[PDB]
């Protein structure tokens, strides 16, 4: 047998490489059965400290980017929402891939980084911080901080038609309220039905 969660503790990029990728890959099928545990994500969840320890690093050649994706995902099965947990792992991201729409992963995070992100940048602005408003358009990079940073306000974005292509419009109109649009409502309609998502907005 071989456990591909002893393969993350080490060091040695190449095989380290494939380990982590593959993690991924397995991270919305299966994959490293032979131990007790059904899931890959309970299998994964002592690894954690693991996880975090490398991640801090960066003199890691491709590995830090591939490390903080598996971070997220088990952030993601915990069900444990970030404030600077998920949403630090989430932020460095940039091998990331858009898979379990199907189950929590789409829905998760994006209504974590909207909620988070609002009731932040509101909070602060009273008590003293370089922001200003709630953010409400997108690209906020919120002081330089942790809470959101430029590129992660386009995959929420990027979500929201993702959501309409899937006819999970309910869930789409849901996460443009919260949010708080105004320009990304009428960009993020150019196929499907406009129609039926504008009304109930």
């Known amino acids: 047998l071989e456990l591909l969660v002893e393969r993350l503790k080490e060091d040695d990029s190449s095989l380290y490489e494939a380990s982590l990728n593959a993690l991924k890959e397995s991270i919305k099928n299966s994959t490293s059965s032979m131990t007790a545990v059904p899931k890959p994500l309970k299998f994964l969840r002592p690894t954690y400290p693991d996880l975090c ?9 491709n590995l830090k980017s591939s490390l903080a994706d598996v971070l997220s995902i088990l952030a993601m099965t915990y069900s444990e929402n970030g404030k600077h947990d998920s949403l630090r792992y989430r932020l460095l991201s940039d091998v990331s891939d858009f898979e379990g729409w199907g189950h929590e992963y789409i829905r998760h995070l994006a209504l974590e980084i909207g ?24 690209s906020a990079a919120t002081s330089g901080f942790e809470f959101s940073k430029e590129d992660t ?14 006819n999970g419009e309910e869930d789409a109109v849901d996460l443009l309220l919260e949010i708080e649009s105004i320009d990304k409502l009428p960009q993020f309609v150019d196929e499907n039905t406009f129609q039926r998502v504008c009304q109930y907005m």
């Open 115 to 138: 909620e988070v992100y609002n009731d932040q940048v509101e909070k602060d602005a009273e008590d003293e911080t370089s922001s200003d408003g709630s953010k409400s358009d997108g």
């Open 153 to 166: 306000l386009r995959l929420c974005l990027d979500i929201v038609p993702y959501f309409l292509k899937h």
């Open 53 to 61: 320890s490398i991640y801090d690093k960066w003199t890691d050649p």
